[PDB]
Design a protein around this motif. Structure first.
Motif, PDB file in Angstrom:
ATOM      1  N   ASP A   9       0.850  -1.192   0.000  1.00  0.00           N
ATOM      2  CA  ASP A   9       0.000   0.000   0.000  1.00  0.00           C
ATOM      3  C   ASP A   9       0.886   1.243   0.000  1.00  0.00           C
ATOM      4  N   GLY A  13       2.128   9.012   3.056  1.00  0.00           N
ATOM      5  CA  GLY A  13       2.862   9.151   4.293  1.00  0.00           C
ATOM      6  C   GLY A  13       3.583   7.877   4.663  1.00  0.00           C
ATOM      7  N   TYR A  14       2.853   6.766   4.694  1.00  0.00           N
ATOM      8  CA  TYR A  14       3.391   5.491   5.152  1.00  0.00           C
ATOM      9  C   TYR A  14       3.037   4.408   4.147  1.00  0.00           C
ATOM     10  N   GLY A 169      -6.028  10.033   3.881  1.00  0.00           N
ATOM     11  CA  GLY A 169      -4.652   9.649   4.089  1.00  0.00           C
ATOM     12  C   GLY A 169      -3.812  10.834   4.501  1.00  0.00           C
ATOM     13  N   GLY A 195      -3.437  15.097   5.947  1.00  0.00           N
ATOM     14  CA  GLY A 195      -2.465  15.237   7.020  1.00  0.00           C
ATOM     15  C   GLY A 195      -1.334  16.204   6.735  1.00  0.00           C
ATOM     16  N   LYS A 223       4.510  17.638  13.397  1.00  0.00           N
ATOM     17  CA  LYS A 223       3.915  16.307  13.372  1.00  0.00           C
ATOM     18  C   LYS A 223       3.614  15.790  14.775  1.00  0.00           C
ATOM     19  N   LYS A 226       0.615  17.738  16.445  1.00  0.00           N
ATOM     20  CA  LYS A 226      -0.589  17.297  15.748  1.00  0.00           C
ATOM     21  C   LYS A 226      -1.101  15.968  16.288  1.00  0.00           C
ATOM     22  N   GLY A 322      -5.399   7.663   8.629  1.00  0.00           N
ATOM     23  CA  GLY A 322      -4.904   8.211   9.878  1.00  0.00           C
ATOM     24  C   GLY A 322      -5.313   9.644  10.158  1.00  0.00           C
ATOM     25  N   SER A 323      -5.606  10.423   9.117  1.00  0.00           N
ATOM     26  CA  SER A 323      -5.992  11.806   9.360  1.00  0.00           C
ATOM     27  C   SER A 323      -7.401  11.944   9.918  1.00  0.00           C
TER      28      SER A 323
HETATM   29  N1  LIG Z   1      -3.260   9.931  16.484  1.00  0.00           N
HETATM   30  C1  LIG Z   1      -3.262  10.625  15.323  1.00  0.00           C
HETATM   31  N2  LIG Z   1      -4.018  11.729  15.174  1.00  0.00           N
HETATM   32  C2  LIG Z   1      -4.031  12.430  14.029  1.00  0.00           C
HETATM   33  N3  LIG Z   1      -3.308  12.101  12.951  1.00  0.00           N
HETATM   34  C3  LIG Z   1      -2.503  11.017  12.968  1.00  0.00           C
HETATM   35  C4  LIG Z   1      -2.433  10.198  14.179  1.00  0.00           C
HETATM   36  N4  LIG Z   1      -1.572   9.200  13.918  1.00  0.00           N
HETATM   37  C5  LIG Z   1      -1.128   9.363  12.647  1.00  0.00           C
HETATM   38  N5  LIG Z   1      -1.688  10.448  12.089  1.00  0.00           N
HETATM   39  C6  LIG Z   1      -1.459  10.953  10.724  1.00  0.00           C
HETATM   40  O1  LIG Z   1      -2.065  10.125   9.749  1.00  0.00           O
HETATM   41  C7  LIG Z   1      -1.558  10.647   8.526  1.00  0.00           C
HETATM   42  C8  LIG Z   1      -1.766   9.659   7.391  1.00  0.00           C
HETATM   43  O2  LIG Z   1      -1.232   8.379   7.700  1.00  0.00           O
HETATM   44  P1  LIG Z   1      -1.730   7.182   6.763  1.00  0.00           P
HETATM   45  O3  LIG Z   1      -3.207   6.999   6.986  1.00  0.00           O
HETATM   46  O4  LIG Z   1      -0.764   6.030   6.851  1.00  0.00           O
HETATM   47  O5  LIG Z   1      -1.557   7.922   5.348  1.00  0.00           O
HETATM   48  P2  LIG Z   1      -1.462   7.102   3.974  1.00  0.00           P
HETATM   49  O6  LIG Z   1      -1.998   5.744   4.342  1.00  0.00           O
HETATM   50  O7  LIG Z   1      -2.316   7.889   3.016  1.00  0.00           O
HETATM   51  O8  LIG Z   1       0.000   7.125   3.632  1.00  0.00           O
HETATM   52  C9  LIG Z   1      -0.114  11.017   8.826  1.00  0.00           C
HETATM   53  O9  LIG Z   1       0.099  12.381   8.473  1.00  0.00           O
HETATM   54  C10 LIG Z   1      -0.007  10.878  10.327  1.00  0.00           C
HETATM   55  O10 LIG Z   1       0.683  12.003  10.864  1.00  0.00           O
END
Ligand SMILES: Nc1ncnc2c1ncn2[C@@H]1O[C@H](COP(=O)(O)OP(=O)(O)O)[C@@H](O)[C@H]1O
Lengths: 411, 167, 281, 314, 123, 178, 227, 227
Positions: A9, A13-14, A169, A195, A223, A226, A322-323
């Motif tokens: 995937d 971000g990840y 995301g 995010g 980060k 946040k 995650g956002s």
């Molecule tokens: N507890 C949290 N509260 C708010 N945002 C978070 C938290 N943990 C992670 N994130 C944010 O979730 C965002 C997206 O992560 P992710 O869902 O893996 O993105 P993607 O899957 O699109 O790469 C990142 O910017 C991360 O900082």
């Protein structure tokens, strides 16, 4: 025996890595690549030119985020792959170093953002079929996997095959209506906030307010505050007044460690607790040219869907990515929607003289613990099924037809 | 066999005659404007194809029309390794056709690359510099492939060293 | 990465995490995970019988029958000892730790667990090296089907232990490029005087191996290593065994990368052509 | 070379006011700009912008002071200077494909439009409707009509075409015009009769022109050839092939000399003699017109081209 | 399915002059018979092969005199045969035709080539 | 989208140019009547200010929005002076001298919104709205000066001075002509 | 230990020798083989201070200029270094990348009585003996024959340089195992056919035809009929 | 116009400024060094007119970029630009003083003592902007006050091992003299608290008298009118 298919995937971000049939991804890694920067002595006139085996001297993931002599690059931008040279290298080390799967005998499930340009699907299939030698590939729509992750995890008897999935995301937010397992692709809307924009808005707001954060760690601290100190607020103008009057309780100290001197430093954390994730409801803050709140876009998506499905959708709004994990996020989105839908009905009573009262609409917004890796889990469950090997593009198909087999999409 | 200077000069003088394009709205659909060499829907507007070749493997085909000219050229893949490296070079050049305004996104069958010039290109771009680009491509292409062959040989040797030296 | 590393990260990560929580003592959280490796290996980590305090690793080599003919059994017992429990069902080896008794030498037990595929292969080499280091010569020759169409032949000779990797190249690109790499392996001694002799036979079996049903065809290649006493001796055998069994994937890995490296250069050469056409604007 | 770049983009047609004080041009779009010679330098004075697609021909009637325009939108419009602003009049052109060329008749009672519809529309005013109405020449035209010129008697019309052949047609509109006198081309001339056909078979015919006596037509073709058909030799046609690129437009400047221009970007003179009946390259872009002295004894002529701008020659 | 419905649609003289060594006239002898009108295909391939024999058997230093002896009609015909031989490559043939091209171009200019491209009755 | 808009457009309240002469609860001399409700237009502006500066589109409902926006533009200017002030006493003395300066009025050049305010045509318009806008400025500065200085030390507080950079939709009442 | 002075020292020596004049014999006490061996080492693995990776290019340029004035391959103080150096991997490669483009790095100045083309010269001096002909790896020499068999074809008659590539093929044919691997022999013969028949009459064209007659008389496999 | 346009268009490229992908150091370096020349080779009144264009947007954007940039190479050229701009007009100085720039320079110096070249230029530019004695935001004293004054006193008393030119002692004297210039009153003055608290200041003492003996004023580096 029969080897499990790989699930990758490629998030903005990840990136999330593993094999089919596992309840978790084996690795969560930041989608960045560290390349040797010393070429910048020559590369003043033109982009770095590679020779020998210098292009194998790179690191990705946590091995790459803080190396002292490599420049970190971030290949993915708005979910789209923006520099295929760097992404192609990123794939090599993902497959051979982390997964250690020989590509030749593992099917790959490789995810896609719904905004992905067809040209970018051609390239991604071309790299997987022809730079590597995958026996079969399936480019899967992230939103459907996120819904199925909730479907297969949530309680039996409430496993509705219909819902509106909001995926936020790190790059972009997508609002996807699903009915009876079919994506209503015409009705998709995209919100250009995620995010990164929340992070950058905090990053700017700290740099106005709180000089003393060293520029290298400006992104790190934005980060961190946040993810740990921010929350979705109930009402903006009133929150500023709350912070001004009870600042002793609302202002929180954050203490950071200097990357070089390893002296500690500390900051007040303040309005950027509720500012930040507010940009979901006021996109005009972070983005000059978008203005509809998320709680406005979601209703416009549903109220474009066929009349029969609208009521089922409001019952099963799925948050993913995650956002969406900010505290009190779903609680406010529901309140804004409920205030929007019940007024829509109340109008149609008066324009009918009260001769009939409409049934309410039960706006419900649902959240589940997979949300950090929900798309991946939904993929690993799909990839376990025997149908997956029937759905994939087989390598022989890419021999009869070129990259063009991957032009198509759900829309 | 034949030397490179006559071959390019014959191509230049030919291609110089074919770039006498004009604007021409089509006869077959209400008011579409399209390059006749690609739509081919009326045949009194197509010029006689002409071909220039210096040996049995390197040939340039010119297909004219009242409003467009298609130039498709083949280069000698002398080695098994050059076929692979040439295909990739053309693919990555053809993958960027929106920047090379005169380039097709697929080759003409049996040619390695194929340019398509419209009247608009001869009106907006310097016509004589379009010829010089086709010629500059045709001069440099085999030097560029030779460089790739050398650079791959070098990499294979360094990778072989990095394994054996550990024993 | 130029060389492929030998230790599986998923074992190395998950065991190190679980043993860390055992040292903290905080909680025996459940684990169940399956993952492949190269050579069609199919590991499984699980809690045995649901005992969250016990952790069991299993290997699933498809070719373990007619590899335990060459030891691959006493070696596992010599290296793992008390950790080498009975095989889990469907798997040929299992390896059980527990968070109650694991020693403070955590790093040693986790690192040796990651080597499990290497410690399976190593017995054929260690046996035949010990033959050469002791002058036997008439012994039978080891045939190991490390993939289902692709076989390793280890043969002992009074002066030499030779390791023939049959191998198969799936696309014509890989045949043409692969034929380049092994030409540079043929000459590679010129820059490394002590290195083993590497011979490459392409479509045809090498003439000494030509007494078994070795395959013939355009996709097939035979690579022969020659290991001298400077490699097979008791000081060097362990490093030599680490290198040799990875060679096949080393070769295929660099074929992939070299295609990617070409693509980088092609985009550069394209950009310098485009820079010319921009002068026509 | 007097020269002025109005535009970088192709000046797709031009036409000249009666005393040459104003010039009408297409700036490579669907608008017509009129410029007045404001001393040494041109200034734009009007912008006729009714068309819905690119204008492909302009002509300016010198006695009546009316501008006719046609385009790839299949419209034509006649523009009259109502007080101070040009206002259009509808042409019921009835063509199903792009228009390509327009020329007013020497008597300015009628005009002709050549088109991609394989017809020539002959237009005349229908005052009960306050619009312009057409009759179509049709039968032998096999492809699009590229250029037109009128005989000085305003009845005979010469047409070049993509089917390689120059032709002369009798455009006698009995509704508006008295019957013409006999001519060396013929005595018969009812509407649409075919008086002449070219011997040519290869190149497209880009430009066609009459001599000021009307006794000679010359044309230029994509073969890089010039031809001249002389009615007093009973339609014997001279030919001269040339070494340079094709010629796009041609005009007589006397009964015995032509000027032409082409993709070589410079004007070329071709003389002729009625004795041997041969053209001669006297030597030296999109169209040519005579400023002063007319086709009988030109003193100045001008050129415009795809390379942009206007140029005047003596 | 509506969308997919298709709807709305000399050699005995040539080798004599060559064997006499009258090579300049042997070029003329070939160019007397242009099969332009012929519906037959094999006649065209024959005529092209005959003229190619003269172009190949000519000495390279004499091509200047040969081309200069032709009239402007012959030069346009010579070009129409030159561009034909390029479509039948052979080890020597391309090297000489590329030389015949340069001298025919010096005589006829780019205009002579345009009359190859515009020639509606393919020779 | 919806930034905060003025609440107090009573139909009784007179207009000059395109601005509504809302009553003010101030001891400063000026032509608008004395307000007696707790909320006031200057307090609307001051209450909304922190939120209002973040929005980037602003739709004028009425003349009162053209009035309240002017206050926020002036607040985004007074913060520039008082961030430099060592003490509340310095700021209060400073702010009195700021507001009396001759800021441009509608359509007089350098005024930032010539597209959106029309110039008063006559003396009894012009002089009175100068006399109005002056007392708005005088009051507006003093009300900031009461609350931007932290009472523990007269530090012009971080939480208010943070906004100095954040001009209201990039509009400056200083005017871009200088 | 002074990377800047080293670079300028190498550059100036290349500039100085760029006109190919003979030197005092006293110079070769230093400018002889030990200095040539030093330059080969700088190219083969460089120095820790060379963070620009710039000495290898300057030292390749320098060996071409140093050799430019020597008359023959047998006595040649540079070639005796290449013979004795343990392994010349990198220098072999860099020399082909220059030949492929076919430019001369040593003509850094516009002075008019120009010397021979330095890289064609240096290769003819390499191949003049069997001990230095072994410099090349097999894949490198295959690419060399390919590069030169191309350049000999493309150069028009009367070019000074076409003789030099003809001479370099003559050298390669005469001292490498060429006729036992024959890598491009069909294409070479097809060109030598054309060159020998070439009816152009300039002095350099006569010399090109003569060296083909020398080459085919020495090796009758050249000039034989096509397969 | 072109430079200030493009620098702004990069400064706000919020993706590239935090999640870098493109290579951009080269183009920025070329634009900055071109800017630096025009600010010193061209007519000063044109250069003024572009800086003061829209309430100093060209200046303030470039300042905001300096806070955001962290390549030391690019930072160093930005400082040189700020000095040339600072020379043009007291209206530019008072803008730079009021912006964020002084705070980032003082934070940079206290934390990154290793780049001697940036450290010297930082103290120079910081003394230049304060040279007019303009009042600063009170928020500046948080960094600029007593901690930073002690840091400067340590440098002028003890030096740094990396300073071989002793420029930092002299520059730190000038910088303390510049910061003091605008402070009112006496007892609460943040610099005087540092002098009181510092452990046996003495080199600063005798350096200071050598200025008084000659009677010059190092801080009056520019000819701007209200002395
Ligand atoms: N507890 C949290 N509260 C708010 N945002 C978070 C938290 N943990 C992670 N994130 C944010 O979730 C965002 C997206 O992560 P992710 O869902 O893996 O993105 P993607 O899957 O699109 O790469 C990142 O910017 C991360 O900082």
């Amino acid at each position: 025996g029969r080897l499990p298919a790989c699930v990758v995937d490629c998030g903005t971000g990840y990136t999330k890595l593993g094999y089919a049939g596992n309840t978790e991804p084996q690795f969560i890694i930041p989608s960045c690549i560290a390349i040797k920067e010393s070429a910048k002595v020559g590369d003043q006139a033109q982009r770095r030119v590679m020779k020998g085996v210098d292009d194998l001297d790179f690191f990705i993931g946590d091995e790459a985020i803080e190396k002292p002599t490599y420049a970190t690059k971030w290949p993915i931008r708005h979910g789209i792959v923006e520099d295929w040279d760097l992404m192609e290298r990123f794939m090599e080390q993902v497959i051979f170093k982390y997964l250690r799967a020989e590509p030749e005998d593992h099917y790959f499930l490789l995810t896609e953002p719904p905004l992905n340009t067809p040209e970018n699907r051609e390239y991604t299939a071309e790299i997987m079929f022809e730079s590597f030698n995958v026996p079969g590939l399936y480019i899967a729509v992230q939103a459907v996997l996120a819904l199925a992750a909730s479907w297969t995890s949530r309680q039996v008897g409430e496993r509705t095959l219909t819902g509106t999935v909001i995926d936020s995301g790190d790059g972009v937010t997508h609002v996807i209506p699903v009915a009876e397992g079919y994506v209503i692709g015409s009705c998709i809307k995209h919100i250009p906030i995620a995010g990164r924009d929340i992070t950058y808005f905090i990053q700017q707001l700290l740099r106005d307010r709180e000089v003393g954060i060293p520029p290298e760690q400006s992104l790190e601290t934005a980060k961190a505050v946040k993810e740990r100190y921010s929350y979705v607020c109930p009402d903006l103008v009133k929150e500023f007044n709350k912070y001004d009057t009870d600042g002793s309780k609302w202002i929180k100290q954050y203490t950071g460690i200097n990357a070089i001197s390893k002296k500690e430093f500390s900051i007040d954390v303040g309005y950027e607790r509720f500012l930040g994730p507010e940009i979901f409801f006021h996109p005009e803050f972070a983005n000059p040219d978008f203005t509809q709140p998320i709680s406005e876009v979601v209703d416009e998506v549903i109220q474009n869907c066929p009349i029969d499905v609208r009521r089922p959708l409001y019952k099963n709004i799925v948050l993913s990515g995650g956002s969406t994990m900010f505290r009190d996020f779903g609680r406010r989105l529901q309140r804004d929607l409920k205030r929007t839908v019940d007024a829509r009905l109340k109008l149609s009573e008066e324009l009918s003289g009260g001769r009939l009262k409409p049934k309410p609409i039960d706006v419900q917004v649902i959240t589940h613990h997979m949300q950090r890796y929900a798309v991946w889990f939904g993929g690993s469950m799909l990839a376990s099924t025997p149908e997956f090997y029937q759905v994939c593009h087989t390598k022989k198909d890419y021999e009869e037809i070129g990259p063009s087999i991957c032009r198509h999409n759900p829309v | 066999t034949a030397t490179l200077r006559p071959y390019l000069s014959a191509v230049r003088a030919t291609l110089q005659a074919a770039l006498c394009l004009e604007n021409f709205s089509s006869q077959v659909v209400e008011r579409h404007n399209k390059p006749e060499v690609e739509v081919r829907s009326s045949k009194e507007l197509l010029l006689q194809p002409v071909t220039i070749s210096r040996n049995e493997k390197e040939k340039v085909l010119i297909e004219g029309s009242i409003n467009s000219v298609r130039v498709s050229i083949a280069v000698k893949q002398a080695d098994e390794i050059e076929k692979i490296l040439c295909h990739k070079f053309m693919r990555f050049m053809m993958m960027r056709a929106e920047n090379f305004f005169i380039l097709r996104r697929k080759p003409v069958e049996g040619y390695d690359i194929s340019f398509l010039i419209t009247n608009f290109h001869t009106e907006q771009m310097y016509k004589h510099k379009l010829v010089d680009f086709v010629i500059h491509f045709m001069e440099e292409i085999d030097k560029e492939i030779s460089e790739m062959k050398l650079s791959v040989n070098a990499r294979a040797r360094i990778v072989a060293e990095e394994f054996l030296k550990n024993f | 990465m130029i060389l492929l590393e030998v230790n599986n990260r998923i074992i190395e990560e998950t065991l190190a995490l679980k043993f860390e929580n055992a040292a903290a003592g905080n909680k025996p959280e459940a684990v169940e995970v399956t993952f492949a490796d190269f050579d069609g290996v199919l590991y499984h980590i699980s809690n045995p019988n649901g005992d969250k305090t016990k952790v069991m690793v299993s290997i699933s080599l498809k070719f373990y029958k007619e590899l335990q003919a060459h030891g691959a059994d006493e070696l596992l017992k010599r290296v793992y000892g008390s950790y080498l429990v009975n095989p889990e069902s469907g798997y040929n080896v299992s390896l059980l730790y527990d968070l109650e008794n694991l020693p403070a030498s955590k790093d040693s037990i986790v690192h040796q667990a990651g080597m499990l595929k290497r410690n399976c292969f190593a017995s054929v080499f260690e046996k035949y090296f010990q033959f050469q280091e002791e002058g036997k010569e008439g012994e039978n020759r080891a045939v190991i089907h490390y993939r289902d169409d692709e076989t390793m032949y280890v043969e002992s000779k009074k002066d030499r232990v030779t390791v023939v990797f049959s191998t198969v190249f799936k696309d014509d690109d890989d045949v043409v490029i692969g034929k380049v790499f092994m030409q540079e392996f043929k000459e590679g001694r010129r820059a490394s005087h002590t290195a083993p002799q590497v011979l490459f036979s392409h479509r045809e079996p090498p003439l000494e191996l030509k007494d078994t049903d070795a395959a013939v065809g355009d996709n097939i290649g035979y690579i022969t290593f020659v290991l001298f006493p400077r490699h097979t001796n008791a000081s060097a055998r362990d490093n030599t065994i680490n290198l040799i069994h990875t060679f096949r994937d080393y070769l295929h890995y660099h074929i992939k990368c070299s295609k990617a490296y070409i693509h980088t250069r092609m985009r550069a050469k394209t950009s310098d052509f485009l820079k010319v056409l921009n002068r026509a604007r | 070379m007097a020269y002025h770049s109005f535009l970088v983009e192709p000046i797709s047609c031009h036409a000249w006011n009666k005393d040459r004080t104003q010039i009408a041009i297409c700036p490579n779009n669907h608008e017509v700009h009129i410029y007045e010679k404001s001393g040494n330098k041109w200034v734009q004075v009007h912008e006729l912008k009714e068309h819905n697609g690119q204008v492909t021909g302009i002509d300016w009637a010198p006695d009546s002071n009316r501008i006719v325009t046609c385009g790839t939108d299949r419209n034509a419009y006649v523009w009259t200077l109502k007080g101070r602003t040009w206002k259009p009049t509808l042409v019921i052109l009835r063509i199903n494909r792009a228009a390509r060329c327009v020329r007013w008749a020497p008597n300015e009672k009628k005009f002709a439009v050549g088109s991609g519809s394989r017809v020539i529309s002959i237009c005349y005013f229908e005052q009960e409707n306050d619009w312009w109405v057409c009759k179509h020449i049709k039968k032998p035209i096999r492809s699009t009509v590229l250029s037109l010129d009128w005989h000085p008697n305003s009845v005979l019309l010469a047409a070049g075409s993509c089917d390689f052949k120059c032709r002369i047609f009798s455009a006698y509109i009995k509704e508006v015009e008295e019957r013409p006198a006999p001519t060396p081309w013929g005595s018969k001339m009812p509407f649409g009769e075919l008086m002449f056909e070219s011997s040519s078979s290869c190149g497209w015919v880009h430009g066609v022109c009459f001599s000021a006596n009307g006794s000679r037509v010359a044309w230029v073709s994509h073969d890089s050839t010039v031809c001249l058909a002389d009615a007093d030799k009973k339609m014997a046609v001279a030919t001269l092939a040339s070494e340079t690129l094709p010629l796009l437009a041609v005009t007589f400047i006397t009964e015995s000399s032509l000027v032409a221009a082409g993709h070589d970007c410079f004007p070329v003179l071709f003389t002729y003699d009625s004795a041997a009946g041969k053209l001669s390259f006297g030597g030296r872009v999109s169209q040519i017109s005579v400023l002063s002295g007319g086709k009988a004894k030109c003193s100045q002529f001008c050129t415009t081209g795809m390379d942009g701008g206007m140029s005047i020659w003596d | 399915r509506f969308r997919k419905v298709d709807v709305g649609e000399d050699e005995g003289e040539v080798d004599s002059c060559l064997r006499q060594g009258n090579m300049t006239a042997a070029l003329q002898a070939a160019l007397k018979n242009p099969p332009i009108n012929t519906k037959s295909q094999a006649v065209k391939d024959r005529a092209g092969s005959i003229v190619l024999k003269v172009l190949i058997s000519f000495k390279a230093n004499d091509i200047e005199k040969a081309v200069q002896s032709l009239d402007k009609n012959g030069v346009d015909l010579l070009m129409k045969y030159i561009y034909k031989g390029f479509e039948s490559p052979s080890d020597n043939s391309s090297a000489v035709l590329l030389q015949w091209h340069e001298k025919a171009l010096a005589a006829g200019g780019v205009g002579s080539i345009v009359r190859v491209l515009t020639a509606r009755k393919t020779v | 989208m919806p930034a905060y808009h003025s609440s107090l457009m009573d139909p009784d309240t007179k207009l000059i140019g395109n601005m509504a002469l809302l009553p003010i609860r101030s001891q400063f001399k000026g032509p608008a009547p004395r307000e007696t409700k707790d909320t006031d237009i200057v307090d609307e502006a001051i209450y909304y200010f922190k939120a209002n500066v973040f929005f980037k589109n602003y739709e004028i409902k009425n003349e009162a929005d053209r009035t309240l926006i002017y206050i926020t533009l002036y607040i985004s200017e007074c913060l520039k002076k008082l961030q430099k002030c060592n003490s509340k006493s310095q700021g209060e003395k400073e702010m009195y001298t700021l507001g009396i300066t001759n800021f441009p009025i509608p359509g007089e050049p350098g005024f930032p919104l010539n597209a959106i305010y029309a110039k008063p045509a006559n003396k009894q318009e012009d002089e009175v709205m100068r006399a109005y806008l002056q007392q708005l400025r005088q009051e507006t500065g003093l009300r900031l000066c009461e609350k931007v200085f932290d009472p523990q030390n007269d530090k012009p507080s971080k939480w208010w001075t943070c906004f100095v950079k954040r001009q209201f939709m990039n509009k400056s009442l200083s005017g871009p002509g200088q | 230990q002074d990377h800047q002075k080293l670079c300028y020292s190498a550059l100036i020596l290349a500039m100085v020798f760029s006109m190919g004049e003979a030197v005092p014999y006293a110079h070769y006490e230093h400018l002889g083989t030990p200095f040539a061996q030093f330059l080969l080492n700088i190219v083969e693995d460089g120095l820790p201070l060379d963070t620009t990776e710039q000495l290898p290019d300057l030292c390749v340029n320098l060996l071409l200029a140093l050799n430019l004035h020597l008359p023959a391959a047998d006595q040649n103080v540079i070639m005796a270094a290449l013979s004795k150096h343990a392994n010349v991997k990198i220098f072999s490669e860099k020399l082909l990348l220059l030949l492929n483009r076919g430019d001369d790095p040593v003509r850094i100045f516009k002075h008019e009585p120009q010397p021979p083309h330095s890289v064609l010269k240096f290769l003819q001096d390499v191949f003049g003996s069997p001990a230095t002909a072994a410099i090349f790896y097999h894949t490198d020499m295959m690419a060399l024959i390919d590069i030169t068999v191309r350049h000999i074809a493309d150069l028009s008659p009367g070019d000074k340089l076409r003789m030099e590539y003809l001479s370099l093929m003559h050298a390669i044919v005469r001292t490498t195992p060429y006729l036992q691997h024959r890598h491009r022999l069909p294409d070479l013969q097809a060109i030598l056919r054309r060159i020998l028949n070439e009816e152009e009459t300039s002095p350099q064209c006569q010399m090109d035809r003569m060296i083909v007659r020398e080459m085919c008389k020495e090796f009758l496999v050249l000039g034989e009929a096509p397969s | 116009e072109v430079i200030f346009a493009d620098l702004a268009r990069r400064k706000d490229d919020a993706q590239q400024r935090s999640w870098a992908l493109y290579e951009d150091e080269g183009v920025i370096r070329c634009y900055l060094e071109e800017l630096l020349h025009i600010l010193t080779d061209a007519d000063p009144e044109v250069c003024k007119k572009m800086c003061k264009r829209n309430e100093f947007e060209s200046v303030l954007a470039l300042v905001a970029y300096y806070q955001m940039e962290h390549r030391a190479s690019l930072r160093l050229l930005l400082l040189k630009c700020f000095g040339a701009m600072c020379s043009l007009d007291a209206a530019i100085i008072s803008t730079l003083v009021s912006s964020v720039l002084p705070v980032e320079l003082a934070r940079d110096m206290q934390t990154d003592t290793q780049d001697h070249q940036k450290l010297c230029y930082s103290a120079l530019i910081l003394a230049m902007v304060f040279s007019m004695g303009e009042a600063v935001p009170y928020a500046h004293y948080e960094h600029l006050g007593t901690p930073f004054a002690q840091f400067l006193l340590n440098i002028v008393e003890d030096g740094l091992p990396l300073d071989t030119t002793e420029q930092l002692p002299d520059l730190c004297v000038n910088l303390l003299l510049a910061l003091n210039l605008h402070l009112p009153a006496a007892d609460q003055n943040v610099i005087m608290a540092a002098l009181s608290k510092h452990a046996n200041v003495k080199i600063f003492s005798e350096k200071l008298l050598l200025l008084l003996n000659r009677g010059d004023d190092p801080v009056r580096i520019f000819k701007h009118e209200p002395q």
